[PDB]
Design a protein around this ligand. Structure first.
Ligand SMILES: COc1cccc(-c2nnc3n(Cc4ccc(C(=O)N5CCC[C@H]5C(=O)O)cc4Cl)c(=O)c4ccccc4n23)c1O
Ligand SMILES: CC1(N)CCN(c2cnc(-c3cccc(Cl)c3Cl)c(N)n2)CC1
Length: 480
């Protein structure tokens, strides 16, 4: 559960929530300078507020570490005590939020939708005078159950009195209401309201821009990240620790790229994950470290990748984001058992293309061209103000990949390999559907993102990137 995240509270409400309803060790997280977050913790009868910043690459906690998601941050600190501080700050008791705004089924002020979009077990909750309504589709019919709100507690007319709509919903999901004549009011899935027909994107973007709808949709997607805390054990191994750019941003074990090139102790690790929507696939990875450049080339060779997308400069804000893992133009280099030649560099307005020749030392017949698309103009913080640049680049990447018979996954990297990497990958997935199925196709932005996030932690980091994905898809349809 992610109940410790309160979307509509202020620092004062946070202080009062913790002081009157919490104990020492009680905590919550909340949004802010908008785009920022706060971890409010009770310690020795007083409330401490800790800043969490995210400009697009990772959640950066003051006096703490860098994380892929707020759920991974909270999971880590509740499990590993002494890491948050010079005195230590302990996260013991999540202070639960009763607000249903970030719930998939909660539709505030609202049968047409349930009849059109719904199926057996599709449900929603809307607001009635201070009471609520639970609308369910079964089959086929729609049944409305009234939700009474009496003294801050919710009930369906009898039985238990719930402290939140979430507790009521979860209860009647486990224990369904049965009608006298035998209809089981099964709450299988929330009604889908995010799937749109691609030709109607401008209309959805206009509605999401109204007071903003993008924030509510994004925060509801963020609330589902608690279902994605998959094991990341391999990345934690002692021998793998210095192979991670950020110690707490790790690849899921179930999708990590396993290296079999093996020099005969622990030669099978890279901080990278296969992303499936081979030739139609991606490898999402971090910017190389000096000690992972050989592993990077071993991955590229093994997976038969012919295209690399780099979405960072080597250096941003005087900080190294990715080592230069490729030779200078016309130069030849050996990176362990792999040999790379940089044949030619071509400079475009937003990017540089490097034509590389990769082969294994001692084996001539293993040579293949690897095209490196280096996007150089993405801002240091936030996202581009216009997506034309990104789209033109992605179009070029897509055509290069399409032209190469049996090419492996497209390798995509930035610094941590989750924010800009996730953004470019999601735009590419969505645009690919519009290529195949045409403008009369269905697209579901948060569905696509949730699917990518189950393959690598925190793919698509911010609300600014979320909105950029909608703008990029809108611009692609408008230029069709
Ligand atoms: C079914 O799901 C799962 C099944 C099995 C494993 C996991 C699992 N995978 N990763 C994590 N993490 C992240 C993490 C863990 C350790 C370190 C770390 O470097 N080490 C090693 C030396 C000291 C320690 C330390 O820094 O204190 C860094 C990170 Cl980021 C957690 O926090 C975590 C917390 C509660 C439960 C599982 C966790 N879990 C799992 O999710
Ligand atoms: C008004 C409201 N409270 C805010 C918007 N809203 C929704 C609904 N569903 C998703 C969704 C879709 C597919 C996968 C995943 Cl994981 C998610 Cl969470 C979403 N992001 N927002 C509807 C309710």
């Amino acid at each position: 559960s992610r109940r410790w995240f309160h979307p509509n509270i202020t620092g004062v409400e946070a202080e009062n929530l913790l002081l009157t309803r919490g104990v020492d060790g009680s905590f919550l997280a909340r949004p802010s300078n908008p785009g920022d977050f706060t971890l409010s913790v009770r310690r020795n009868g007083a409330v401490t507020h800790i800043k969490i910043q995210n400009t697009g690459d990772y959640y950066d906690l003051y006096g703490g570490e860098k994380f892929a998601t707020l759920a991974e941050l909270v999971q880590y600190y509740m499990e590993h005590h002494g890491q948050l501080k010079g005195d230590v700050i302990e996260l013991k008791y999540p202070l639960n939020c009763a607000d249903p705004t970030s719930e998939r089924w909660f539709h505030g002020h609202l049968e047409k939708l349930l009849t059109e979009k719904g199926k057996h077990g599709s449900f929603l909750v809307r607001e009635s005078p201070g009471d609520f309504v639970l609308s369910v589709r079964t089959g086929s019919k729609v049944t409305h159950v009234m939700i009474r709100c009496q003294e801050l507690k919710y009930d369906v007319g009898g039985g238990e009195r719930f402290d939140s709509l979430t507790d009521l919903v979860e209860h009647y999901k486990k224990n369904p209401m049965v009608e006298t004549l035998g209809t089981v009011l099964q709450l299988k899935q929330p009604l889908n309201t995010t799937r749109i027909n691609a030709a109607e994107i401008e209309s959805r973007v206009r509605e999401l821009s109204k007071l903003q709808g993008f924030w509510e949709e994004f925060e509801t997607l963020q609330q589902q990240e608690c279902k994605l805390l998959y094991s990341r054990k391999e990345g934690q191994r002692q021998e793998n620790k210095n192979k991670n750019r950020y110690k707490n941003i790790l690849p899921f074990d179930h999708t990590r790229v396993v290296l079999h090139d093996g020099d005969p102790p622990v030669s099978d690790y890279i901080n990278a994950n296969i992303i499936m929507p081979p030739k139609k696939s991606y490898i999402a990875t971090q910017g190389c470290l000096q000690n992972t450049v050989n592993d990077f080339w071993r991955m590229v060779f093994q997976e038969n990748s012919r295209v690399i997308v780099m979405t960072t400069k080597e250096v941003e804000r005087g900080k190294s984001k990715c080592v230069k893992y490729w030779p200078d133009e016309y130069a030849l280099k050996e990176y362990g058992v792999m040999r790379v030649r940089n044949v030619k560099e071509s400079a475009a307005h937003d990017y540089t293309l490097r034509e590389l020749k990769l082969s294994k030392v001692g084996q001539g017949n293993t040579e293949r061209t690897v095209w490196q698309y280096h996007f150089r103009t993405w801002p240091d913080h936030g996202v581009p103000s216009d997506p034309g640049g990104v789209l033109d680049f992605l179009e070029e990447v897509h055509h290069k990949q399409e032209s190469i018979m049996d090419a492996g996954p497209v390798v995509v990297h930035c610094s941590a390999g989750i924010g800009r990497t996730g953004t470019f990958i999601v735009i590419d997935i969505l645009i690919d559907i519009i290529r195949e199925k045409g403008v009369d196709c269905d697209i579901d932005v948060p569905k696509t993102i949730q699917m990518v996030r189950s393959q690598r932690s925190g793919m698509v980091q911010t609300e600014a990137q979320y909105r950029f994905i909608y703008m990029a898809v809108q611009h692609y349809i408008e230029t069709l």
